[PDB]
Write a protein that binds this ligand. Structure first.
Ligand SMILES: Nc1nc2c(ncn2[C@@H]2O[C@H](COP(=O)(O)OP(=O)(O)OP(=O)(O)O)[C@@H](O)[C@H]2O)c(=O)[nH]1
Ligand SMILES: [Mg+2]
Ligand SMILES: [Mg+2]
Ligand SMILES: [Mg+2]
Ligand SMILES: [Mg+2]
Ligand SMILES: [Mg+2]
Ligand SMILES: [Mg+2]
Ligand SMILES: [Mg+2]
Ligand SMILES: [Mg+2]
Ligand SMILES: [Mg+2]
Ligand SMILES: [Mg+2]
Ligand SMILES: [Mg+2]
Ligand SMILES: [Mg+2]
Ligand SMILES: [Mg+2]
Ligand SMILES: [Mg+2]
Ligand SMILES: [Mg+2]
Ligand SMILES: [Mg+2]
Ligand SMILES: [Mg+2]
Ligand SMILES: [Mg+2]
Ligand SMILES: [Mg+2]
Ligand SMILES: [Mg+2]
Ligand SMILES: [Mg+2]
Ligand SMILES: [Mg+2]
Ligand SMILES: [Mg+2]
Ligand SMILES: [Mg+2]
Ligand SMILES: [Mg+2]
Ligand SMILES: [Mg+2]
Ligand SMILES: [Mg+2]
Ligand SMILES: [Mg+2]
Ligand SMILES: [Mg+2]
Ligand SMILES: [Mg+2]
Ligand SMILES: [Mg+2]
Ligand SMILES: [Mg+2]
Ligand SMILES: [Mg+2]
Ligand SMILES: [Mg+2]
Ligand SMILES: [Mg+2]
Ligand SMILES: [Mg+2]
Ligand SMILES: [Mg+2]
Ligand SMILES: [Mg+2]
Ligand SMILES: [Mg+2]
Ligand SMILES: [Mg+2]
Ligand SMILES: [Mg+2]
Lengths: 243, 19, 166, 117, 190, 95, 148, 97
RNA sequence: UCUCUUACUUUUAACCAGUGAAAUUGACCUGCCCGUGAAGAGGCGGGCAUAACACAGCAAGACGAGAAGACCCUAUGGAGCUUUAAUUUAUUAAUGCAAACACCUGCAUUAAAAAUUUCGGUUGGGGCG
RNA sequence: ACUGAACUCCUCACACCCAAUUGGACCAAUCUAUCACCCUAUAGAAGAACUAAUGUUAGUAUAAGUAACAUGAAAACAUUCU
RNA sequence: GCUAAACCUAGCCCCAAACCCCACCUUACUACCAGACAACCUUAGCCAAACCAUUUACAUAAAGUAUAGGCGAUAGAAAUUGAUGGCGCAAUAGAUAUAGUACCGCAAGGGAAAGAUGAAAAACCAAGCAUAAUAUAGCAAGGACUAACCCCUAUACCUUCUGCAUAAUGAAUUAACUAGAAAUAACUUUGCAAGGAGAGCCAAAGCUAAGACCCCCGAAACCAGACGAGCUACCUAAGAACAGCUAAAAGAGCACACCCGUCUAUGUAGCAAAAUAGUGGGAAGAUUUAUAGGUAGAGGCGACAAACCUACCGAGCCUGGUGAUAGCUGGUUGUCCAAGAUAGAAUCUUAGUUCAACUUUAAAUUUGCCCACAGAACCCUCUAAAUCCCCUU
């Protein structure tokens, strides 16, 4: 027989059914949205159309992203959307020669970064691309807050983003205590990225983590039916007394 | 090279059947 | 499976007219699923075929084959039922008109051979059938004499025609 | 070579046969020298009542009226046990009426159940 | 045929369960060579050339040919005196007995195909009469077809149905070759 | 060739034929003579003139090319200024 | 099916294979016979004979401006924009016997065709239509149903 | 002995049940209804071969294209293998080439 | 051992009783000689012989059973192994240059290790020539 | 002189003797549509026809009642003896 | 008259619609003690390219077009367009299924068979034989005949082949099952007609629709992922055995148990898928052996024998790709009629294929064959049967 739904919609159906249904709307929308990551290992085409020299005709051109393998060690660091390229090459760069499996790995450096919002020093395995992105953003905090998930490509990066966003939303006095002027200066500097604490809490949570968080939020020891029946009986007796 | 073809055993039910 | 031999005893003939020869009684009996090869039973059946009941019993009592005892039991049962139910006046006045052995329902077994090879044994079973006809056994067909033999030859000579002509 | 037969203590070498049991609940522990220390509190104590004078024979007379089945419910138990006192004291702290905030501190805790049968 | 979709299917030797291993080696066994116990030769094996999947027999005759076939059917009925025109299908009563008796009296066939202009407006009397009958079949004009016209011995038409059929079937004559499907707007086509 | 493409189930065209032969709508296939650009220094003027000519094909070669190309390549093409426009039909041909 | 060999087994080589000899369709040099064939513009011919026939039969009304839409509606020409057709070209064929006075707009026109049209008192203009506009004008109703 | 010894139970066919009686009705829905509906729209059956016909390879390709994502795992594997085999057979085997 | 074999016992064996396979098998109403022939006849031609059947031995034939010959050739069929066969260095080890301020990464070069694939045809069988 | 073919004549009738391949006329059975109603007809379909693949499954033969197999002796069937 | 024969429904196939008490991860199905250990990483190969090495597919229309491609085998878009059951099976069929059971394998894994009474059971036909053994002689029949045989004639069938009774292949036999799938273009028949078609496509009588042509089984292989060191190779832990005699702390001698397997006989579907009897080597050591564990196939282990790795290791087994591929072998099933044997070329090609030639069918047209003179070279002194050409006939 045939499944009622295509197999590729089963994950979405599971999202719509169950505790995933009780998950907050903004988090579900963030999971659904699939904005394409910034090109890292390929040069994107300048325009949507190109005059092909072979016949001098305007033909549509599409940017096909190169698949990137992110080893689990990357999720503990900050690689600027960079990862292993697992592909193949033609020996001596001629298609009539042998084809060989080639893995291009990024150059990883151990560096120390200071987060003004977190006021903490993080030692992170990083790529020169990530360093350049940090320089462009004018700081680790700016880089984390500006970069979306799909370009940040790091669970640790998203956790840092959640921490920064939560501190921004709460205006935490724990940021540089006994220095309210400095704390206010930092929060004003990173003001534009502030979002409601409710959303900031769920920012950067995997689906399993969100499920666990929702389960812990909605776990309530059953109320003894003694209390429910007592309340009902008291209400009924109140009605009888009034009428 | 040595050539040996292993004996093939028929299923046992065929023999064990009874009235 | 077929069981027509048993039914053959249930046929009822219409009453015979007074001016009609007395129909000799016929009794069909059989034994089914005898643990014995039909080929081996055939020899006993042929032996007792055409003889009187008493002579058949006498031969079987002293034959050594296992099937001899079974056939003797079947014949004794046939005699008893012929006297009791089929209105046969005298026990001894019966002769074996028909006696044959039929294949029974056999079982297949495995015989193990030397090199992991095998054969298919057959636990052979056989049936046994008898018809007992009342009256003295029919006389054995006498061998044809030289006189009748020459008579047949002369008849063959006389039957000759001029073949392939008017 | 037998996979379809149940795994029991009757199968296996001496160690297997000794180690596997038959479902009997443990009664104590083992100390040095394989000496078995049996704990009295771990032995179930059959609380058999006094049947003298009991008027309920195992069977019921066939000349007995038939009544509809009314499975006891939490609401029914509350109505038959707590509702009268609640009404009286309402006309005139739920522990007084009977509610127990926590099962801890009881010999017979309803949940998690800690008593047999 | 065009509606036909045969749902007959058989498992080929690739779809029969099992049959992966070679039953026995090529040589030395003294038996025939085989590569799986599910080849078509084996009992319980696949079917070499059997019906495959749900197969469609769909094909469309030219609409001109189909209209001409309708015309030919009508002419055959008229020539053989099986066509009966009516002013309307209104009956004095809804009793199927009346309709059957009337057909028998008028010497109609054992089977009558009554046609009315539109489904919605068909008289209640004839609807009731023909709902209970098996050989008297009431259809709207849009449902007229050669197969049913041939299956039913006599064909009863109303005057509005006659005009409808004449217009629809004659339009095919003198229509252009289509520029696009006639469901789309045309300068003069309803 | 591919009698049934795995993606469309259609018949495919051998593009090697398209790169070499011209089909006239009449059913004739035009071609260039092999070696017309090779070793011209050792070929005589008559041979070069023969090789520089556009040539037709056998009936069997034409049938092979028709089989190897799909119906799209046998259509009627009204190009703007086709140098072979006049050759797309036969005139005064008996059988 | 024959006897043994590849033919009976149903495994004979592909079409165009010559048994290993360099095939005919591969020993011939490549020549740009069909280069850009899909980018060459094509114009359906509309002979003056055809135009006069249409006018005589009333399928094309000469009292109103004649253009590609009117020709298609009268079924005088069949345009296939998907097949690189860029419109209609007037053709001198039938010029000597052309008599209708018409205002026709086409995409190409021969000198003799223009001469005939203008001699008979009509007017002819060559109008360009890019593929999209050509499709729309040839089949306006489907475009109007597209809702664009 | 592959012949039955008794007549099979009589097969009675009602030639005038509803299905047979109304068979063919609305086959001319198009020509007799202003072409609002094409007759192929009267075809009830598998989604991938409604108003369409083709050989086995084409049918398999269409099934995979149209309902492939909704097919069961082993059925889809069987369909892929069948398409592969049919491709090889039709494009590499046969009397004519 | 043999000249040179003999005697006896047991097993097997043969007969009686019970149980009861296997390869094999186109059908067989299944002879000898000469000749013939797809090149060695029970079956064909010319002769000869010729009631019917059991049982026990024999191994000259049924080109006897057995294994779709492991010999030989062929196949644009395989696979194992060796290389100084073709194509590679994806992989490791080195170096050199970049990158970073030894490790890691990228690019090259050299080795080790291997990986994929092939091993033409005619031919008085194949090889050599 | 005669014997002597499927050559030829004679009486009647004539499509009625080449492998691969090719053309054609029929057609068994099944189902569907209409007929028919002690076995059918006109059509549409197709898992549509088996003296042969060391073919597959099942039955039964042949080899064959053959090769092979088994239980120490007497007896009261207690027991004893070898 | 025995074996038996049949039987109709158990179910199944394709679609539509619709989204779907207790015990048990330790040795699973085991009440009850300090953990810490945690997942992600390109498919490959067969096969096609007639080898192989780059390469080789995994709604409609545009379009098999643009493009890609040892530019070759083949691969191949997009813009744009608009989108209610059964001419099914009916117990060798249909699911493997009465069941993933029995059974087989250490494991992964493989994987069956079959049943039929009646409203109520509280009621004639396959093979094989038997009835009934057989008579000179012979493909077992045919012509016959008064007559079964006797007389005369007759070298089973299929496949393969130049050619088979062939002492070439297959076949014991009955029943059941078991093997021609489709485009292009043509041909026939309709419809309409300079237009046809129910968008797209074709069109210089075309277009639309239909009819009608393309088999089955078989390798050694290759790759991927599992499963295997209860046998065996080696190793790890901790055990055990080694009488007696001679000698003396011995990889010592004789010789039990024990290990092995030299030679012979038997056996060779065996007792045994490697045994028995005798004979023989070692038997305190580099010995033998019970137990548990380890090394896993691009591998392991090896006192190298290409040994051994669960009976078949030049590289295991299972599953999957896989219906691998096979120019090679075998098979390829109703009746009847007709035509039908034929030069060569190229080819990693001579076991094949493409073209030609021949053959077949349909159609158009007019010459086709036979052949009178006349005519077709000297070299070469002579030098043939003939041929070519060719009106008439
Ligand atoms: N094609 C097809 N139609 C089916 C199938 N099962 C049911 N139907 C149809 O479903 C319709 C309703 O079936 P019923 O059983 O009468 O009613 P129902 O239970 O309400 O139907 P469902 O809602 O479909 O379950 C009828 O037209 C059936 O023929 C099926 O497997 N295939
Ligand atoms: Mg054994
Ligand atoms: Mg037997
Ligand atoms: Mg399989
Ligand atoms: Mg195979
Ligand atoms: Mg099946
Ligand atoms: Mg053959
Ligand atoms: Mg050949
Ligand atoms: Mg070559
Ligand atoms: Mg005996
Ligand atoms: Mg001889
Ligand atoms: Mg003898
Ligand atoms: Mg012989
Ligand atoms: Mg010999
Ligand atoms: Mg032999
Ligand atoms: Mg051989
Ligand atoms: Mg050799
Ligand atoms: Mg090779
Ligand atoms: Mg004569
Ligand atoms: Mg019929
Ligand atoms: Mg068949
Ligand atoms: Mg048969
Ligand atoms: Mg057979
Ligand atoms: Mg016997
Ligand atoms: Mg014998
Ligand atoms: Mg014996
Ligand atoms: Mg290849
Ligand atoms: Mg091939
Ligand atoms: Mg698109
Ligand atoms: Mg079954
Ligand atoms: Mg019989
Ligand atoms: Mg032979
Ligand atoms: Mg041979
Ligand atoms: Mg044989
Ligand atoms: Mg071990
Ligand atoms: Mg000692
Ligand atoms: Mg020693
Ligand atoms: Mg060596
Ligand atoms: Mg060696
Ligand atoms: Mg093994
Ligand atoms: Mg094959
Ligand atoms: Mg002939």
């Amino acid at each position: 027989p045939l499944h009622k739904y295509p197999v590729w919609l089963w994950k979405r159906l599971q999202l719509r059914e169950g505790i995933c249904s009780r998950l907050p709307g903004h988090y579900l929308r963030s999971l659904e949205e699939e904005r394409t990551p910034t090109p890292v290992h390929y040069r994107p085409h300048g325009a949507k159309f190109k005059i092909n020299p072979k016949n001098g005709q305007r033909e549509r051109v599409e940017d096909v992203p190169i698949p990137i393998y992110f080893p689990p060690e990357s999720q503990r660091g900050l690689w600027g959307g960079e990862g292993w390229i697992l592909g193949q090459i033609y020996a001596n760069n001629d298609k009539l020669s042998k084809r060989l499996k080639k893995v291009w790995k990024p150059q990883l450096f151990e560096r120390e970064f200071y987060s003004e919002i977190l006021d903490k020093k993080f030692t992170v395995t990083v790529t020169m691309r990530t360093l350049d992105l940090i320089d462009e953003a004018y700081g680790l905090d700016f880089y984390i807050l500006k970069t979306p998930k799909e370009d940040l490509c790091s669970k640790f990066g998203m956790d840092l983003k959640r921490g920064m966003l939560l501190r921004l939303a709460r205006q935490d006095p724990q940021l540089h205590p006994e220095d309210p002027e400095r704390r206010a200066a930092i929060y004003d500097k990173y003001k534009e990225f502030a979002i409601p604490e409710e959303e900031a809490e769920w920012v950067g949570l995997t689906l399993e983590e969100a499920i666990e968080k929702q389960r812990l939020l909605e776990e309530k020891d059953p109320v003894p039916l003694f209390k429910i029946y007592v309340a009902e009986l008291i209400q009924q007796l109140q009605q009888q007394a009034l009428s | 090279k040595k050539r040996f073809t292993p004996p093939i055993y028929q299923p046992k039910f065929k023999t064990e059947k009874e009235f | 499976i077929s069981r027509k031999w048993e039914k053959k005893n249930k046929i009822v003939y219409p009453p015979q007219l007074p001016g009609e020869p007395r129909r000799p009684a016929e009794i069909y009996h059989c034994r089914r699923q005898i643990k014995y090869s039909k080929d081996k039973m055939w020899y006993l059946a042929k032996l007792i075929r055409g003889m009187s009941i008493d002579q058949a019993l006498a031969q079987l009592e002293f034959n050594d084959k296992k099937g001899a005892k079974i056939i003797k039991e079947v014949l004794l049962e046939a005699q008893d039922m012929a006297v009791r139910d089929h209105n046969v006046e005298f026990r001894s006045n019966l002769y074996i008109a028909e006696s044959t052995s039929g294949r029974g329902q056999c079982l297949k077994r495995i015989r193990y051979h030397g090199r992991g090879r095998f054969g298919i044994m057959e636990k052979v079973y056989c049936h046994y059938f008898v018809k007992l006809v009342e009256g003295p056994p029919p006389p054995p067909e006498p061998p044809k004499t030289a006189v009748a033999h020459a008579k047949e030859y002369i008849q063959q000579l006389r039957s000759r025609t001029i073949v392939h002509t008017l | 070579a037998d996979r379809m037969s149940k795994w029991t203590s009757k199968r296996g070498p001496r160690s297997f046969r000794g180690r596997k049991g038959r479902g009997a609940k443990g009664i104590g522990f083992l100390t040095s020298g394989w000496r078995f220390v049996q704990i009295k509190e771990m032995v179930p104590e059959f609380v058999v009542p006094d049947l003298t004078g009991f008027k309920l024979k195992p069977y019921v007379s066939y000349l007995a009226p038939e009544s509809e089945e009314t499975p006891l419910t939490a609401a029914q138990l509350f109505s038959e046990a707590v509702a009268p006192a609640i009404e009286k004291d309402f006309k005139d702290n739920l522990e007084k009426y009977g509610f127990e905030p926590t099962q801890e501190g009881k010999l017979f805790q309803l949940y998690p159940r800690n008593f047999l049968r | 045929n065009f509606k036909r979709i045969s749902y007959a299917k058989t498992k080929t030797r690739a779809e029969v369960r099992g049959g992966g291993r070679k039953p026995w080696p090529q040589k030395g066994t003294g038996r025939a060579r085989h590569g799986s116990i599910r080849s078509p030769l084996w009992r319980g094996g696949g079917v070499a050339h059997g019906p495959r999947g749900p197969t469609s027999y769909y094909y469309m005759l030219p609409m001109k040919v189909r209209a001409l076939g309708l015309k030919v059917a009508l002419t055959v009925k008229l020539a053989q005196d099986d066509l009966h025109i009516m002013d309307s299908l209104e009956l004095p009563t809804g009793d199927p007995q009346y309709l059957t008796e009337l057909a028998h009296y008028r010497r109609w066939g054992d089977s009558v195909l009554l046609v009315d202009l539109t489904h919605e407006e068909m008289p209640q009397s004839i609807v009731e009469a023909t709902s209970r009958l098996k050989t008297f079949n009431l259809i709207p004009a849009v449902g007229l077809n050669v197969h049913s016209m041939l299956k039913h011995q006599t064909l009863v038409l109303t005057l509005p149905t006659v005009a409808f059929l004449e217009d629809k079937l004659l339009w095919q004559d003198s229509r252009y070759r289509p520029l696009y499907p006639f469901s789309l707007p045309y300068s003069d086509f309803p | 060739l591919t009698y049934f493409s795995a993606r469309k189930g259609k018949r495919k065209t051998v593009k090697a034929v398209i790169d070499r032969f011209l089909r006239l709508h009449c059913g004739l296939w035009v071609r260039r003579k092999a070696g017309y650009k090779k070793k011209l220094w050792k070929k005589t003027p008559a041979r070069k003139k023969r090789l520089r000519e556009f040539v037709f094909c056998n009936k069997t070669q034409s049938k092979l090319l028709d089989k190897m190309t799909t119906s799209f390549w046998k259509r009627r093409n009204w190009y703007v200024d086709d140098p072979y426009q006049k050759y797309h039909d036969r005139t005064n041909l008996k059988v | 099916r024959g006897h043994k060999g590849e033919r009976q087994r149903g495994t004979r080589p592909r079409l165009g294979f010559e048994g290993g000899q360099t095939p005919f369709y591969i020993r011939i040099p490549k020549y740009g016979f069909n280069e850009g064939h899909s980018f060459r513009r094509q114009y359906k011919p509309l002979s003056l004979n055809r135009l006069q026939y249409l006018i005589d039969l009333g399928r094309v009304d000469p009292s109103q401006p004649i253009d590609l839409t009117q020709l298609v509606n009268g079924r005088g020409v069949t345009i296939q924009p998907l097949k690189r057709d860029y419109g209609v070209q007037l053709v001198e064929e039938g010029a000597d016997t052309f008599t209708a006075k018409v205002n026709i707009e086409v995409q190409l026109a021969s000198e003799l065709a223009i001469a005939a049209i203008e001699k008979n008192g009509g007017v002819v203009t060559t109008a360009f239509y890019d593929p999209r506009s050509l499709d729309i004008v040839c089949k306006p109703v489907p475009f109007f149903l597209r809702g664009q | 002995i592959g012949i039955r010894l008794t007549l099979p139970p009589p097969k009675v066919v009602d030639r005038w049940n509803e299905k047979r009686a109304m068979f063919g009705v609305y086959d001319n829905i198009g020509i007799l209804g202003n072409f609002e509906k094409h007759p192929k729209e009267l075809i009830r059956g598998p989604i991938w071969l409604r108003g369409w016909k083709g050989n086995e390879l084409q049918r398999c390709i269409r099934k995979r294209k149209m309902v492939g994502s909704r097919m069961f795992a082993d059925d889809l594997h069987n369909l892929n293998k069948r398409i592969r085999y049919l491709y090889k057979h039709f494009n590499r085997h046969g009397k004519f080439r």
